[PDB]
Structures are given as C-alpha cells and as structure tokens.
From a paper:
To examine the heme-binding potential of HphA, acid-acetone extraction was used to strip the co-purifying heme. The resulting apo protein is devoid of heme and refolds to its native conformation as indicated by the absence of a Soret signature in the UV–Vis spectra and X-ray crystal structures. Apo HphA also crystallized in a C2221 space group, with three monomers in the asymmetric unit. All apo HphA chains adopt an open conformation and do not show structural heterogeneity in the heme-binding region. Comparison of holo and apo structures reveals that the loop containing H43 undergoes a large conformational change upon heme binding and release, while the 310 helix containing H106 is only slightly displaced. Size exclusion chromatography-multi-angle light scattering (SEC-MALS) confirmed that HphA exists as a monomer in solution, regardless of the presence of heme. Apo HphA interacts specifically with hemoglobin conjugated to agarose beads as evidenced by pull-down. Based on the pull-down results, we propose that apo HphA binds to Hb largely through its heme-Fe coordination residues, H43 and H106. This mode of binding is plausible as the loop containing H43 is flexible and could wedge itself into the heme-binding site, positioning HphA to capture spontaneously released heme using H106 in a relatively quick step. The loop containing H43 then dissociates from Hb and clamps down on heme in a relatively slower binding step.
Here, we show that [name] Slam secretes HphA, which functions as a hemophore that acquires heme from hemoglobin and albumin. HphA is composed of a C-terminal 8-stranded β-barrel packed against an N-terminal clamp-like structure through 6 intermediate β-strands. Once secreted, HphA has the dual capacity of binding hemoglobin and scavenging heme. HphA along with its cognate receptor, HphR, function together as a two-component receptor required for full virulence and facilitating extrapulmonary dissemination and/or survival in the blood.
Residue numbers in the entry: 22 to 264
C-alpha cells in the first residue's frame, strides 16, 4: 500500500512498515548504512517522534503553515543526535497535513546538502487513491531543499483531463530560489507523473531537472515527488495538498 521513490537506494530506501491499522502498511524509510533499527524500514511517524524526543538537543518537529495548509516538518541533524546515531544521518522531511504523504531529503554525517550523498525521496499510502479524469485542481505545495526551516512553496496546477502538472516554487533561503515544472505529465486517471524541471538559485540556472512523483488519496487529495538535477544542491522533494 506504500508507494515512493528514493534518488539513491544505496543510501535511502522507501517502503512499508507493518501496522495494525493499515493492512497495506505505513510509509517508512530505511537508512542502508545505519545501526539497528534504522537500517530496517522505520515509519516516518516514528522518526517524527524521535525528532520530538531529541528537541532539547537540536532536533525539531514543527507544524508549518503554507498558505492555508499545514505541513509537519521534522529536522534531524547529526549534530543534535548521539554518536551511535551518526550513521542514521541527517533528515529533513515533511508531511502533507495529516495525510499519509511524506517527502524529504537526507545526507550523510559530515556531508552537506551540496554533497553527493544528498538524497531526496517521497512516500505515501496509495490504498484510497483515485485520480479524476477531467477538470483541473490546484495544490498548495511545499518543497524541501537542504533546509528544515526555509521551505520552498508555491502552487501546482493539475489538469486531469489533459494529464499535465504545471507550476513554480520559490525559496527564501535555500540553494534553489525558483523551480519550474517542464512537461510534467501523467496518463489521465492514473497517479504517477514525471517530466523535467528547471531551477535557478545560488549555482545559477540548471535545466537538467528530472521530476517523478504521484497523486495520493481519494480524488487526488495530495501529491508528492522529487526533482533531481546534475547539481545535487538543487535536488528537491515536495508535497502538495489539493485546494
């Protein structure tokens, strides 16, 4: 019941954890090089709890309002964590409201989001997903790009009948200051989309973006995805709530 992608499965895998309330499982992430239990699939919900549990030492878990929508953001830096959790790595990830939709990034202890280990991912429950075949909807979108405190944000427009997803995000303190979808599309009535993207920011314009994501929930109440660029500083994960 869980779908999702990781830009680098040698660092991060996305998958399902068993749960008494979800026969298809709950969204989870596995850190390939971490100590137990974090090398198994760990529910994002448990990582949310860890971010709360270590908040006095530098982690955080915050409800952030974007437009009229809430995104729950978890920030887990290696510097805030005990030494045996060094191999757990650095996390920034968000949840689309209380929907079972997560999106975020990771990088290795001692690296930065500019390093090759900068990995982006999304994960979500597909059990109830239905995608309209006609009409249009907009989504309030938040994006994570090397920060848990300065989110990308903007509006994506889904044209369900044409099968297109369009829009632009901007940032106020991340590597990426603007990111535009280019030709991102999906078969009408189906959940998965993909296309290209262009970003601008601290390293200049980068037209090499590749976008992959999907709709989630009844009547496509959410979306999430990732964008990868030749410059991994610009690698971005995003999640949207249907307006």
């Amino acid at each position: 019941g869980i779908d999702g992608i990781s830009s680098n499965e040698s660092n991060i895998k996305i998958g399902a954890a068993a749960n008494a309330s979800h026969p298809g499982g709950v969204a989870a992430v596995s850190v390939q090089a971490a100590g137990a239990p974090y090398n198994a699939f760990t529910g994002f919900s448990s990582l949310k709890g860890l971010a709360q549990a270590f908040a006095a030492q530098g982690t955080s878990n915050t409800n952030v309002t974007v437009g009229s929508k809430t995104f729950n953001i978890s920030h887990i830096p290696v510097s805030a964590m005990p030494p045996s959790h060094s191999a757990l790595g650095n996390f920034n990830f968000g949840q689309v409201g209380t929907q079972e939709v997560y999106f975020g990034e990771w990088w290795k202890a001692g690296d930065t989001p500019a390093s090759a280990s900068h990995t982006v991912y999304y994960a979500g429950d597909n059990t109830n997903t239905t995608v309209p075949t006609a009409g249009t909807a907009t989504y309030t979108v938040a994006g994570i790009n090397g920060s848990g405190s300065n989110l990308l944000s903007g509006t994506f427009t889904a044209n369900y009948g044409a099968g297109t997803l369009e829009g632009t995000l901007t940032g106020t303190g991340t590597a990426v200051s603007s990111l535009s979808l280019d030709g991102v599309a999906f078969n009408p009535g189906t959940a998965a989309f993909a296309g290209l993207a262009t970003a601008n920011g601290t390293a200049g314009i980068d037209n090499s973006g590749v976008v992959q994501g999907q709709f989630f929930g009844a009547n496509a109440s959410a979306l999430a995805g990732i964008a990868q660029f030749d410059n991994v500083s610009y690698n971005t994960a995003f999640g949207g709530a249907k307006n």
